[PDB]
Symmetry: D2
Subunit: 142 residues, 4 copies
C-alpha cells in the first residue's frame, strides 16, 4: 500500500552538508518527498518526541546530541514506504550496516548514525503528526 514514513537527517549529517546526497538517495530509491523542513529542536521538543527513551542510560546524551544543531525532518511517500525506508537506512549500528545503506555511508558513530526512519506505519503516523502541521504534508498533484 502507499505509505508515508518519517525521516530525520540528524545534526551530524546536516553539519557535514550532505542533506542533498541523502535526499538524492531517497529519490533514487523511488520515494517522493511530500513534506520537509529544517528546524533546530529545543530541549522541550526533543524530550516530547523521545520521551519513550526517558528510562535508558544514554537518554541525556541523545537529547543533548539531537539539540546540538539543526536537523531536517521529512515525509517520504511510496508503495511499502515504511519498510523500504528502513531497508534503505540499514542497521542502527554503522558497524553492522551493509555497504551502501545510509547508516553505512553517512554515519559518524553509533549514536551519530546520521538518520532516523519510522519503524512502523503506526509510529510513522505519530512521528509525522508530531512535526508536521496543517498544509505541511503536500500530496503530489503533478
Amino acid at each position: 500500500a502507499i505509505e508515508r514514513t518519517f525521516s530525520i537527517i540528524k545534526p551530524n549529517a546536516v553539519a557535514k552538508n550532505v542533506i542533498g546526497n541523502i535526499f538524492a538517495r531517497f529519490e533514487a530509491a523511488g520515494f517522493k518527498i511530500v513534506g520537509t523542513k529544517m528546524l533546530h529542536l529545543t530541549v522541550e521538543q526533543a524530550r516530547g518526541f523521545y520521551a519513550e527513551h526517558d528510562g535508558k542510560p544514554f537518554f541525556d546524551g541523545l537529547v543533548e546530541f539531537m539539540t546540538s544543531g539543526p536537523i531536517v525532518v521529512s515525509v517520504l511517500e511510496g508503495e511499502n514506504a515504511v519498510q523500504r525506508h528502513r531497508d534503505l537506512l540499514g542497521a542502527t549500528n554503522p558497524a553492522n550496516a551493509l555497504a551502501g545503506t545510509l547508516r553505512a555511508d553517512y554515519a559518524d558513530s553509533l549514536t551519530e548514525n546520521g538518520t532516523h526512519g519510522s519503524d512502523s506505519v503506526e509510529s510513522a503516523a505519530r512521528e509525522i503528526a508530531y512535526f508536521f502541521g496543517e498544509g505541511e504534508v503536500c500530496p503530489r498533484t503533478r
Copy 2:
C-alpha cells in the same frame, strides 16, 4: 561577506524528483542550507509573492504554474552567496544558460526553468522574509 539568499525549486523540478540533486549541487558549491520547507502555494500566496507582475499578460499563467504542485523554498548561506547562487543557477532564460548550470540541466522548457535565485541582496531579504518567519532559519552551531 557572508550572506543569505533565497531559493525556490519549482513544481516541475519537485515533480521530477530532483530535489536531492539540486541540494547536492548547492552543498558541493559551498553553500550551507540554513532554512528549507516544502509547501504548496495557494493562488493568493502566489499572487502576493509575484505581485510586481500583477496586471501583465503572463501573470495568470505564472500563477497557475507556480500553484500547480508543491515547491521547496530555501535559505542558502555563504560568502558572497547572492551572486554565487545566481552563478550556480546559470542564466534565468535557459536559452542563455551555460552547460552544466542548474537551469541548463534541469529546465524542462524555457518557461519552466526549474529554479529561482534572489537577484540581489535587497530582493534576497524581501524573499526570505516573505516565507521565513522570526527564526525559521537556523544558523549552524557545530
Copy 3:
C-alpha cells in the same frame, strides 16, 4: 583485509547514462576505483568470460544482452571489498533487492539488472585478470 573486486556496469545502465551515479555510489560506500575502462564486448569475448555457462538455456540470451552495447568494467579496492561490493549491489533479482541497493535503483529487469560484482576473492582474481593486463590496475599513490 584490503581486497580488490571486479565490477561490470551493464549495457542497460550505460545506455541510461547513470555511470556517474553508480561510480558515486561506489565511492560513497568507501571503495576506491583503481581500474576502469569502457569497451564493447564481441560475441567471442562475451562467450569467453561466461564460459562456465556455455550450454545452458539462457547462455545465448546472456551473450546477446552483454554484447548489445558498451559496458564499463572496473576494479574496486577496499577493506573486505569483495563482500562489501556484493552487499552494495543487493540481490541479483531486482524484485528481491532491498531499496537503495544498486540492483534496486538501477536494474530494468532480472536479465538486465545493471551491475555485476565478483562473488569471491578467488573469482575476483580470475575476473580482473580476464579484463585487466599488467599496469591497468592503479594503486593509489596520493
Copy 4:
C-alpha cells in the same frame, strides 16, 4: 554538430574519490561518456603528452603533478560538446571559476585544478588520439 571532446580527471580529484560526482555532472549536462580508462602516467608518457612544453616554463612541474597519482581520461560526446564541456568546467583558476563549475567544486589550486577539457575540436582530436587507440571509443548502439 555532434562532437567528441577529451576529458582528464586529474590526480587530485581521483585521490579525493570524486570520479563519480564528476561523471554524474557530465551526464546531467547531457554528455554521453563514449570512452574512458584509468591509468597512471609514467614520466615518459607524460613528457610525451606535454612534449610541446619542452624547454618551456612549467614542463617539469606539469609532468610531476600529472604522474603523481592515477587519472581518468575520457571521451565525451554531444552537440557542441567541446565548448559545452569547457562551459561546465569553468575557469582554469578554481578561485575565479563560477560557483558550481567543476573547477570551482573539485579543485583547490590552479595547477591541481581537478579537470582538463579540450580547448577546440582540433585539440580534441589530437588529445583523444594520444590516449585512445583505433576502436577504443565506443559509439552507443542502444
